[PDB]
Design a protein around this ligand. Sequence first.
Ligand SMILES: [Mg+2]
Ligand SMILES: [Mg+2]
Ligand SMILES: [Mg+2]
Ligand SMILES: [Mg+2]
Ligand SMILES: [Mg+2]
Ligand SMILES: [Mg+2]
Ligand SMILES: [Mg+2]
Lengths: 183, 78, 530, 88
Amino acid sequence: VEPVVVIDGKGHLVGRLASVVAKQLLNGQKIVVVRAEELNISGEFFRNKLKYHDFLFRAPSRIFYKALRGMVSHKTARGKAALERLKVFEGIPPPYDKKKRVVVPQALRVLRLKPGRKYTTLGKLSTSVGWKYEDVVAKLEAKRKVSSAEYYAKKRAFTKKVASANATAAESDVAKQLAALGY
Amino acid sequence: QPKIGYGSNKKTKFLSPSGHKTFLVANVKDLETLTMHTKTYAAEIAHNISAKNRVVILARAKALGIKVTNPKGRLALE
Amino acid sequence: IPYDKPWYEIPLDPQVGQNDDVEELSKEQIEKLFERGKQTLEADNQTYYEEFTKDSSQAKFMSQILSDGTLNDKISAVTLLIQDSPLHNTKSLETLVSYCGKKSRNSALQSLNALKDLFLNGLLPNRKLRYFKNQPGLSMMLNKKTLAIFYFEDYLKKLFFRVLEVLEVLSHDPIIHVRLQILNHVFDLLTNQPEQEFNLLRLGVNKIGDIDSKVSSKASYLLLKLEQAHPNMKSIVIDAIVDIALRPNADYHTTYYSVITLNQTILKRSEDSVANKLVKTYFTLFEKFLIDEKNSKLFSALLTGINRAFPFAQIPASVYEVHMETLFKITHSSNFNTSIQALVLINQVTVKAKLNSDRYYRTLYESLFDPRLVNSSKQGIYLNLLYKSLKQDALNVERVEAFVKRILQVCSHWLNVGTITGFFFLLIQLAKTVPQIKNLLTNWEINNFINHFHPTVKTYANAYVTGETEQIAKPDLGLFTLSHFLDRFVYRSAKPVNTEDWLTKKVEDIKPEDKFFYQYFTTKKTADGK
Amino acid sequence: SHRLYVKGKHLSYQRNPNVSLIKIEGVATPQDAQFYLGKRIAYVIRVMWGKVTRTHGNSGVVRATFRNNLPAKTFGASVRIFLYPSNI
RNA sequence: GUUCCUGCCGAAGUAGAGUUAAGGUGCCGGAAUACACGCUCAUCAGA
RNA sequence: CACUGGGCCAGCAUCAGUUUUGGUGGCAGGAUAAAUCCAUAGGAAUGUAGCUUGCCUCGGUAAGUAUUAUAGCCUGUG
Ligand SMILES: [Mg+2]
Ligand SMILES: [Mg+2]
Ligand SMILES: [Mg+2]
Ligand SMILES: [Mg+2]
Ligand SMILES: [Mg+2]
Ligand SMILES: [Mg+2]
Ligand SMILES: [Mg+2]
């Protein structure tokens, strides 16, 4: 429904999000993933650690890329094309920081994983396996959250303006006559 | 895997895309056996024919109006 | 001993750092400390392992892999067990070295690659490894912690040595792939770590004399790369290469590749000792082999090396004088590629030693009529040598004029365009230094080159006759060659002729070589520019 | 605007290169897909023509037959489905 | 040890359309990440 | 330059075979469905309508009979 879909990585499972994104790419939809450092995996920290190790790219984005490439038949032409369609990032780099980001309900940890079951954060795994950039991304994220709070205040003001405009349109006749007649 | 079920229809069997069954021809006398069956059959000059004979066969075939499958072979290449 | 830090960076006892005048501990004192260092190593590190076993999820899942997993999975699990705590887990280090030693080539290569990654991850120091007996500040008052560290350093040095043994046995493996991979690992370790550099270099330079030419070429390439990465070991590498080439049992293959490697070394104006080493080595080898087709190539390479090292080499001229006649014997040899380099060496020695040089110019005037010169790949070196020789002989006007005449004589019957353009450019430049050469045009062959089929040759000849030199770039070999002409003429070079728009290109700007192209395009219109 | 069609995606083959699976927007159920049966499909410059044959699954994916089969590199490519031949 | 290709008979086939058994409907992969129950997440979870 | 007949292609119409999917009409059976509905006597609680007692935040509170009343319900039963 959009030329490009920006999916937040927070609170999602790597397998389900990767499967959904791979399915979308194979259908031609362009998707970009951001804030993949805070992606989630089911199980305990050690088990995912040794899984990524017995694979042994250290960055969370690269781990997500591998998980998604496992779906797609990359060795074929179609799989390669799906792969260039994809984009993955840790944190939000520009210009997507100025664009709202959807959530995939199917991969949400809150809706999927039962309370009282151990999970693992991909950022901690990546840092433990030798990804020495989790620190810089966190400060950028804090700055992004400050900017997002400012944007939320601006959006609240915009919603108040929208309410005033909707009230103004209400006291106009033509819309009221149209609604009564039809639509 | 080859098997009988793949067999082609009899009415279309042994037919070139031109629609003419190929018949080997050695000399003018064998060419003349295909005098009227021009629609059903097309002549094919044998591999061992000399160049001098092939032009005569081609001339007689044109006179009879019988399609030759491999003209300009050993008189031209490919 | 803490595990959170690489075990070399762990702070040692202070007593290590101000004890250089300590009395030499007796061997029993060293032995007891070595033993006490050992017991402290397989001490609490076990308690660390006991702490490790408390995590049942971690112990069981890994023990299953270490027991039932595949070889790749076991190699990985062992590698991690070493990354997490290399000091504590001597059992996993021993286990990893044990996979390197099996009969299975693929797994042994995988295990050795894992060890190479472990070594080249910074786990090995910036410095070399020290034996326990050679540690600084080795005293009775040293603590258990530092004593265990020194014992582990000795153990890891022995580990590296046995890994080198495993390399050596595998490096002679019959399979070409195994030898190539072992060579790559050896040169990686040699380039990136200092430990046992002499032995690693010994193995690598030993593989120059391998039976397979591919392995020898790979070794030569890797050695040249090693020299470039670390210029300071250039002398050591050259000495190592000399150590094999001069062996009584050297074998022609080994010495040939070694001479190639020495030739491809780089020299600077402060390395007179290295150049003086190389020139003497080349002469010793030359006397060794002189005292045929296989010989011709080796002499070609040796002459190349001596020419390369003759600058930068401060050797008395009398040394070359001993071989001078011998060099002339090469100039009439079967392989003209050797005679070119022999003439180069003769010219350089004659110039620096200031010999009479008549015999050299006689041999050059002769070699101009050598029929093999026409089909020689090295015509460019011959061109440069001719230019230098004629420039150096500006006083003998008759001699240089005679060379000019014979040069044109030889050029009239050649097929290589680049060489002919080269001679014409040289003659144009030699005219500047020696203007009397132009008198020959007023006081016959040039008419043919003015009517040469190649437009570039015609333009060069016209410029030489007219004296209009400003529009000539120095001709470059590899240009005007037939394959290059085809690459233009097919219109698909891609690092195209059709892409450029020829409707608007200044006529004089257009190079003579492409004029016909221009015509077609300005006639075709349509797909002129695409 | 001059659009008298709905641009739909080509998913894959039946698994048979002859039959193609087409995903059409705003169609969640087979009942919704039943309307589109018999309509002309056009993959777009060159154009290949075809028609929608029958529904495929509960997601609203439909089967499609073209005069010449799609080259298999168009999985996820945009495809047009016109309203004619209309049955309304 | 095996035994040029195809076909046929017999103890104890090719292509289009539709239907269907065994199965399956997270992706590779065509099908609901559909519903409704009881359970179980165990350091042997469970495919 | 105009029209007409053949052949290739694209669409449509009317048919034939095969199945797929809807909408809708008529008819028979059942306990001539059973319910429901309206009737209908008897009965009960998940006890309405009320009365009575104690205390009462002065309007709600607590439970004894109460079988229909300012709610309803279940059986027999047309
Ligand atoms: Mg033949
Ligand atoms: Mg069938
Ligand atoms: Mg019909
Ligand atoms: Mg009825
Ligand atoms: Mg009835
Ligand atoms: Mg009742
Ligand atoms: Mg009744």
